[PDB]
Amino acid sequence: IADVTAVAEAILPKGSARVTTSVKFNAPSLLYGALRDYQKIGLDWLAKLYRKNLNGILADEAGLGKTVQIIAFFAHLACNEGNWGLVVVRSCNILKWELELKRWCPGLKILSYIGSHRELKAKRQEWAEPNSFHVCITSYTQFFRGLTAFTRVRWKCLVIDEMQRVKGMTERHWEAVFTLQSQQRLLLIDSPRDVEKQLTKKYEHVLKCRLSNRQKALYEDVILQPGTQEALKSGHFVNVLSIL
Amino acid sequence: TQEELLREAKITEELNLRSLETYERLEADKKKQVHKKRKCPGPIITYHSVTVRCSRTFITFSDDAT
Numbered sequence: 001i002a003d004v005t006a007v008a009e010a011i012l013p014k015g016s017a018r019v020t021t022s023v024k025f026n027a028p029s030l031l032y033g034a035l036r037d038y039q040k041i042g043l044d045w046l047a048k049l050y051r052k053n054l055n056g057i058l059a060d061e062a063g064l065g066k067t068v069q070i071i072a073f074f075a076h077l078a079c080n081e082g083n084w085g086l087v088v089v090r091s092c093n094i095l096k097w098e099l100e101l102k103r104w105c106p107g108l109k110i111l112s113y114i115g116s117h118r119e120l121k122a123k124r125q126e127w128a129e130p131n132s133f134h135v136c137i138t139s140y141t142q143f144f145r146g147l148t149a150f151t152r153v154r155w156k157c158l159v160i161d162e163m164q165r166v167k168g169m170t171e172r173h174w175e176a177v178f179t180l181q182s183q184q185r186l187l188l189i190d191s192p193r194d195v196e197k198q199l200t201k202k203y204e205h206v207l208k209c210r211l212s213n214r215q216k217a218l219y220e221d222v223i224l225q226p227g228t229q230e231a232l233k234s235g236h237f238v239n240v241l242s243i244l
Numbered sequence: 245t246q247e248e249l250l251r252e253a254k255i256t257e258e259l260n261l262r263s264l265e266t267y268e269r270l271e272a273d274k275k276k277q278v279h280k281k282r283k284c285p286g287p288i289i290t291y292h293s294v295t296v297r298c299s300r301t302f303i304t305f306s307d308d309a310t
């Protein structure tokens with residue numbers, strides 16, 4: 001089974017390959033925003049990994065835009081490979097996940113796993129019906145509640161995110177995930193500065209503001225307050241903090 | 245299924261993009277600014293001065309009564 005990891009690493013976007021290529025990608029009709037050259041390379045690696053029937057971990061550093069990488073991989077898969085339709089989420093980030101799906105790839109049907117018991121049963125019924133949705137987004141709480149009920153529908157791909165910060169995750173849940181019928185699986189890890197030459201510039205400034213005469217008068221009044229001199233020298237933390 | 249795909253994908257386009265808020269959208273379209281809807285002021289008298297090198301004024305009456 002280690003051969004899968006070996007092949008994935010062979011194609012993994014290492015630092016040199018993470019930027020050093022010019023794959024003349026065309027935008028799948030679903031995708032709209034322009035990725036980076038390095039995010040484009042991650043897209044190519046994901047497409048090859050799925051094409052070769054492999055499961056891999058996203059070794060990119062934290063904070064580089066994994067959401068858009070998965071979204072672009074979904075777009076390329078759906079367009080080139082034609083698998084026109086799962087994501088596991090923890091909390092509010094369910095809203096962020098679907099929002100970014102709609103944002104970069106507005107052409108995909110989205111199914112949300114939020115609702116009442118009656119609404120959740122209706123969602124299940126629609127979820128088993130043909131051509132009902134393309135991407136299903138669910139909460140980890142729902143997955144644990146429906147650990148076995150999720151076994152009924154077969155999936156082209158599955159994504160796991162935020163699990164590392166989710167309470168109650170257990171090896172049995174990983175076994176269930178493997179049991180889930182996703183022909184390919186993807187795992188997102190924040191700990192598998194990076195790729196900064198094309199990230200946002202983040203220009204930061206601090207400018208010096210000379211105190212007004214009124215401010216200086218009040219400042220020296222508060223300093224010269226004999227109580228404040230006594231507190232300053234004594235070092236009593238509460239008093240000096242009040243002065244500060 | 246590429247024809248069927250084009251069909252429901254354009255439908256999905258309409259549905260999803262109608263959810264966003266004129267921002268959040270990567271293709272940030274230009275100059276929406278949603279102007280006022282006017283909304284009634286009953287019968288009105290419009291005073292309109294325009295440049296034509298020269299300046300002209302047009303006074304519009306909404307209805308024949310006024």
Ligand SMILES: Nc1ncnc2c1ncn2[C@@H]1O[C@H](COP(=O)(O)OP(=O)(O)OP(O)(O)=S)[C@@H](O)[C@H]1O
Binds near residue numbers: 199
């Ligand atoms: N120039 C850019 N620099 C960084 N990110 C960009 C840039 N252009 C587009 N993006 C992506 O646009 C998206 C907007 O941010 P969000 O998606 O809300 O945050 P996020 O990257 O999804 O947070 P994560 O992946 O859960 S840690 C991200 O996926 C970014 O990676």
